[PDB]
């Protein structure tokens, strides 16, 4: 959604980038995304990583991944509420009193504070089901700094753990005891609703009935340590076998009133635009295949069913050169389309296509995980006693 | 039918596949282009011989038409060549500006960067005109040394008049002539006559051989009123040279015009910016 | 002393020994700096949201006043911006040129060096106007395929006018808006009434992204005459961008503005050359 | 004197360069100057040239050399007047009546007309000795074409009487006998007052006193042909040994009140202005000769007399750096200056100096020629008997 604050200056971004370098003992906050970035899931992985460890699952929230950064300025003294987007850019939210409770008193929070605390989040929007009221919201799934203490090098269980008592408890108490001291708070906070591996069954059956958005499952290993910048071989992102798909320039090989061949070609180099110049010197492609070669080689035939031929019949427009976007239904091996893209010139560079042919095999249907529910639990029960 | 026909709607995602132009040339400005043509064709009509006492002077004033006191005022709002033959531009900058201007120049002509690029020069002269029975002779007497420093029949070819609306000052460009008496001493025999004019000039001068331009911050007392006028001269050898090798190296005549006209600007603009 | 002292008057004839000024900076020409300033100011006052539909256009007619049939004539001789609210330029260059012009652009667009630099498109449409009870909606209908291609309320913000006396043609530069239609359901709607204005545009177009310019060789037959007209549109992405980041990298806005004007020119000049 | 007419545009001109080309039968007037140029008189030129031929002597007029072109126009038919100056540029004067006279009627002329004749003049300002009033004037010394006929290859002699009978006769008399059917008469024209060589005595005596403007003596050869473009071995320009001269920067070499050493140098390469940047930081030249070097090499020494001292003594300006002009005075070999050229930056490029060094030894005095008088006058008769 629209970002709750703004970035401040470029220097005043550099300054914090520095504070952050040291707080996790690596200066990478210079540039790279501090927070952890997942790798794509594989069947190959099942035996490799989901078999040999103790793992987590929640849905992949489709918000604006934005870390939380909270520190108390040794420039002019006062607590700061800060936000780190996908490109490392820093946002400045208003009033928040992030504390502790080291003693006891049910006031305590009100002068106590939080310093050196880095917690990785997803800023969704949120519908009330009983009322229908939408609201801006921030959800937390891992934390790698609490009160100056670098919680990177430590297992998830203990990374999540601290974050509960440490940051959230005193947010929550503070908001629960004294509702008035804080309308300065622009938006709500909640924990990411964690569940273990052996519950995918319990998971997916919720997947489609959640108030915010969720474009797959995400997988986290308990026993494992977190990470500074970029990718990590044990943090996993699930998406539909259908999700990944590509733009195919549809061209027509043909010799008249019932369906013909629809070959799908992929643009290489930089000859597509150059084509259009003499494309308007056409009757139909028969000869034009001559130059066009320079930018087009095909691999697949599409698939237009008999209640699907009639549908494109009545409404139409010129075709020997439009663009189509289609997931390969793993039930048939071919690929049904679910929209064209007018709003896109060609199809996609051979190379920049190849990389996706990869994933559609790597997936791995929902059931193609569900089947393994009892087999991480059996294999968990084993680690429970073997050690 | 249609199906067979090629998808021509290849226009909505067509912006997706910082040159001077759709040619990579730089078209010379409409003014520049013309001043160039003027400066050229003119020198041309001046015989090759005299062509070396050539003066392409540039002056600050207020292009005034014959039909009235006021500054002129056609209906236009970017600088352009003012075609009217009753129009006349009388240089006379504001004394107060004039003060502020020279310091901007003396300053700018002394910063740590610009070392031996700027050379500044005082002359306080006493210009005399003279008759016979019609020829008129300018004669520059010094005031500290009291000695003849320039003996000339300043004669005029054409002027250009540049009405600069967006600015508080217009510009004359006079490419006139600086004709001597040959080397025999009339300046000694010129007593069979007393002068019919006498000015006094506290002129101070900034030359800059790196463009080809001299800046004449010039106070003239007349003998009522004194006038504070501002001018720019172009290093005539440099000129005559880019002219000589026209046909061959065009580029050189060109960049030498524009850099002439680019100096006008800095001043014409600075001058306007120092009102208030 | 003085007979010893180094002759320091090595300056009064020092001028005889090419920085593009006594500054080394290239001051923005008079007209250019406007179009910038102007264009700029204008963008501002169009609300932020609407900002995506910036058509910055440039056409060629003869500027023609309230008080004459004849083409306008100030007393100026080089392109300047013509402030007269009464002035009206109706785009319409001559056929005999129009013919010759397209060829040049096209030949010039398939030169050995300008291979992947120009993208030529023919289109033949129907622009139709449509009214309520007042709002004016254009709608594209193709002729070969009959298919709504662009559906807008073309609004109009400010215009400039560029008297080009040295050229056979003047230039209206128009910064105006394409507001797409209110209704969720209207391209159908107005295909209700036989359009209360209809035109036929056989338009040939010429992108170049290297400068962000696209060029239109439009033969429109309105329904007794048929006008041929010439336009230079500027890629709104880039234009919006160089505005979007003025403060920061300032000279992006400048360099893209002049390229726009340089392009304005090459055409306007050529369009004047071809004559006879 | 400011040009008689004016050139038109370059185009309108062009046509005429061509129009001359065949009247000379050579493209030469495309860009090369069709008037013959005179090469500096040498000593070696007496026994080779001035002994084995015939000569003519009038003074070098310091007027504006321009040859005369007169053509009727099959553009639309009229005799135009034309002025062909030092570079190939073409001027156009008002009314002139140039004809012939094929029959008798003193009248005959008023209808007749000159077509495609090329004569050579020089344009002076003229001081009328009795009255003092000035007129502009044109004094012509050779012709190389008459009414379409090419009078180049003709012997000087004829070329001149051919310019006498055919071009002057008409003009002059047409103005004696019709002093009103011509007010259109921009200036005046006369023929150059010629004289054979052996009258250097009778020549030289004039030069100083003549009513025009004049530096030197000119030798033109009787039985020698003319020229279109470029110079010629046989046409001879004499100059005062004096006239030759160059601008010597003088840098002073001295280890305090009476005359010290004044050495004179020649700038080479580009190191003068280079030096000028490091010349204002001065105490005195003593240490500068290290950087002054790459531009200045003294091959000279002036001479200052005791009177010639008492004139540079009261007036001054800083010297060590100035510019001077002076000729090697022959009755000494020593070179006293007569003028300082402040009016210029420096000296001259050494090459450009050595070329002038060249001419000064080759300068052959007036007294070096007023000795040859009776000797060409002795051989030149001998020819008349030996041929």
Curated annotation (Swiss-Prot), chains A, D:
<comment type="subunit">
    <text>Heterodimer. The mRNA-capping enzyme is composed of two separate chains alpha and beta, respectively a mRNA guanylyltransferase and an mRNA 5'-triphosphate monophosphatase.</text>
</comment>
<dbReference type="GO" id="GO:0008033">
    <property type="term" value="P:tRNA processing"/>
</dbReference>
<dbReference type="InterPro" id="IPR017075">
    <property type="entry name" value="mRNA_cap_enzyme_alpha"/>
</dbReference>
<dbReference type="GO" id="GO:0045944">
    <property type="term" value="P:positive regulation of transcription by RNA polymerase II"/>
</dbReference>
<keyword id="KW-0548">Nucleotidyltransferase</keyword>
<dbReference type="GO" id="GO:0006370">
    <property type="term" value="P:7-methylguanosine mRNA capping"/>
</dbReference>
<keyword id="KW-0539">Nucleus</keyword>
<protein>
    <recommendedName>
        <fullName>mRNA-capping enzyme subunit alpha</fullName>
        <ecNumber>2.7.7.50</ecNumber>
    </recommendedName>
</protein>
<comment type="similarity">
    <text>Belongs to the eukaryotic GTase family.</text>
</comment>
<dbReference type="InterPro" id="IPR012340">
    <property type="entry name" value="NA-bd_OB-fold"/>
</dbReference>
<keyword id="KW-0808">Transferase</keyword>
<keyword id="KW-0507">mRNA processing</keyword>
<dbReference type="GO" id="GO:0004484">
    <property type="term" value="F:mRNA guanylyltransferase activity"/>
</dbReference>
<dbReference type="InterPro" id="IPR013846">
    <property type="entry name" value="mRNA_cap_enzyme_C"/>
</dbReference>
<dbReference type="GO" id="GO:0005634">
    <property type="term" value="C:nucleus"/>
</dbReference>
<dbReference type="GO" id="GO:0005524">
    <property type="term" value="F:ATP binding"/>
</dbReference>
<comment type="function">
    <text>Second step of mRNA capping. Transfer of the GMP moiety of GTP to the 5'-diphosphate terminus of RNA via a covalent enzyme-GMP reaction intermediate.</text>
</comment>
<keyword id="KW-0342">GTP-binding</keyword>
<dbReference type="GO" id="GO:0031533">
    <property type="term" value="C:mRNA capping enzyme complex"/>
</dbReference>
<dbReference type="InterPro" id="IPR001339">
    <property type="entry name" value="mRNA_cap_enzyme_adenylation"/>
</dbReference>
<keyword id="KW-0506">mRNA capping</keyword>
<feature type="active site" description="N6-GMP-lysine intermediate">
    <location>
        <position position="60"/>
    </location>
</feature>
Swiss-Prot record, chains B, C:
<feature type="site" description="Essential for dimer formation">
    <location>
        <position position="30"/>
    </location>
</feature>
<keyword id="KW-0506">mRNA capping</keyword>
<keyword id="KW-0378">Hydrolase</keyword>
<dbReference type="GO" id="GO:0006370">
    <property type="term" value="P:7-methylguanosine mRNA capping"/>
</dbReference>
<dbReference type="GO" id="GO:0031533">
    <property type="term" value="C:mRNA capping enzyme complex"/>
</dbReference>
<protein>
    <recommendedName>
        <fullName>mRNA-capping enzyme subunit beta</fullName>
        <ecNumber>3.6.1.74</ecNumber>
    </recommendedName>
</protein>
<keyword id="KW-0597">Phosphoprotein</keyword>
<comment type="function">
    <text>First step of mRNA capping. Converts the 5'-triphosphate end of a nascent mRNA chain into a diphosphate end.</text>
</comment>
<keyword id="KW-0507">mRNA processing</keyword>
<keyword id="KW-0539">Nucleus</keyword>
<dbReference type="GO" id="GO:0004651">
    <property type="term" value="F:polynucleotide 5'-phosphatase activity"/>
</dbReference>
<dbReference type="GO" id="GO:0140818">
    <property type="term" value="F:mRNA 5'-triphosphate monophosphatase activity"/>
</dbReference>
<comment type="subunit">
    <text>Heterodimer. The mRNA-capping enzyme is composed of two separate chains alpha and beta, respectively a mRNA guanylyltransferase and an mRNA 5'-triphosphate monophosphatase.</text>
</comment>
<dbReference type="GO" id="GO:0032968">
    <property type="term" value="P:positive regulation of transcription elongation by RNA polymerase II"/>
</dbReference>
<dbReference type="GO" id="GO:1900182">
    <property type="term" value="P:positive regulation of protein localization to nucleus"/>
</dbReference>
<keyword id="KW-0007">Acetylation</keyword>
<comment type="similarity">
    <text>Belongs to the fungal TPase family.</text>
</comment>
């Amino acid at each position: 959604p629209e970002i709750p604050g703004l970035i401040q200056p470029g220097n005043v971004t550099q300054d914090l980038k520095m504070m952050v370098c040291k707080l996790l003992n690596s200066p990478k906050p210079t540039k790279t995304f501090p927070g952890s970035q997942p790798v794509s899931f594989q069947h190959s992985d099942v035996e490799e990583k989901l078999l040999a460890h103790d793992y987590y699952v929640c849905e992949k929230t489709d918000g604006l991944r934005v870390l939380m950064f909270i520190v108390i300025n040794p420039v002019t003294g006062e607590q700061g509420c800060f936000m780190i987007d996908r490109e490392n850019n820093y946002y400045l939210v208003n009033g928040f009193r992030f504390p502790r409770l080291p003693q006891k008193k049910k006031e305590e929070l009100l002068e106590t504070l939080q310093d050196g605390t880095l917690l990785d989040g997803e800023l969704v929007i949120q519908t009330n089901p009983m009322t229908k009221l939408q609201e801006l919201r921030y959800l937390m799934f891992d934390c790698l700094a609490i009160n100056g203490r670098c919680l990177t090098q430590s297992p998830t269980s203990s990374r999540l753990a601290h974050l509960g008592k440490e940051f959230f408890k005193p947010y929550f108490d503070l908001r629960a005891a004294y509702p008035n001291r804080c309308t300065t708070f622009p938006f709500k906070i909640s924990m990411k609703h964690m569940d273990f591996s052996y519950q995918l069954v319990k998971v997916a059956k919720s997947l489609d009935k959640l108030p915010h958005l969720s474009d797959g499952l995400i997988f986290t290993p308990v026993k494992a340590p977190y990470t500074a910048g970029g990718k990590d071989s044990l943090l996993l992102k699930w998406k539909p076998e259908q999700e990944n798909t590509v733009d195919f320039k549809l061209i027509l090989d043909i010799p008249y009133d019932v369906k013909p061949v629809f070959s799908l070609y992929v643009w290489q180099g930089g000859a597509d635009v150059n084509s259009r110049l003499k494309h308007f010197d056409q009757p139909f492609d028969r000869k034009e295949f001559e130059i066009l070669e320079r930018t087009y080689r095909k691999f697949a035939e599409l698939s237009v069913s008999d209640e699907e031929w009639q549908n494109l019949k009545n409404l139409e427009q010129p075709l020997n050169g439009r663009i189509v976007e289609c997931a390969k239904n793993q039930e048939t091996g071919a690929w049904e389309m679910l929209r064209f893209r007018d709003d896109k010139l060609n199809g996609n560079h051979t190379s920049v296509v190849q990389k996706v042919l990869e994933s559609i095999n790597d997936s791995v249907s929902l059931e193609d995980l569900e089947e393994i529910v009892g087999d991480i639990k059996r294999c968990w029960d084993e680690r429970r006693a073997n050690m | 039918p249609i199906w067979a026909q090629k998808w021509k709607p290849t226009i909505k995602a067509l912006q997706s596949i910082i040159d001077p132009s759709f040619l990579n040339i730089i078209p010379d400005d409409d003014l520049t282009k013309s001043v160039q043509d003027w400066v050229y064709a003119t020198i041309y009509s001046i015989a090759p011989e005299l062509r070396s006492f050539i003066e392409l002077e540039m002056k600050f004033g207020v292009i005034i038409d014959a039909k009235g006191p006021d500054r002129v005022n056609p209906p236009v709002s970017s600088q352009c060549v003012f075609t009217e033959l009753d129009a006349h531009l009388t240089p006379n900058i504001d004394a107060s500006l004039f003060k502020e201007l020279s310091k901007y120049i003396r300053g700018i002509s002394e910063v740590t960067e610009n070392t031996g690029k700027f050379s500044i020069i005082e002359s306080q002269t006493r210009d005399s005109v003279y008759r016979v029975g019609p020829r008129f002779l300018r004669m520059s007497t010094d005031i500290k040394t009291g000695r003849v420093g320039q003996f000339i029949e300043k004669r005029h070819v054409a002027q250009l008049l540049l009405y600069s609306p967006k600015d508080s000052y217009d510009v004359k460009i006079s490419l006139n002539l600086e004709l001597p008496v040959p080397d025999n001493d009339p300046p000694e025999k010129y007593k069979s006559q007393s002068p019919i004019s006498e000015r006094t000039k506290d002129r101070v001068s900034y030359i800059h051989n790196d463009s080809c331009t001299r800046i004449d911050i010039t106070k003239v007392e007349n003998h009522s009123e004194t006038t504070h006028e501002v001018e720019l001269e172009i290093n005539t050898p440099a000129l005559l040279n880019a002219f000589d090798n026209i046909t061959n190296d065009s580029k050189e005549y060109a960049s030498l015009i524009r850099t002439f006209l680019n100096n006008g600007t800095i001043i014409r603009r600075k001058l306007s910016s120092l009102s208030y």
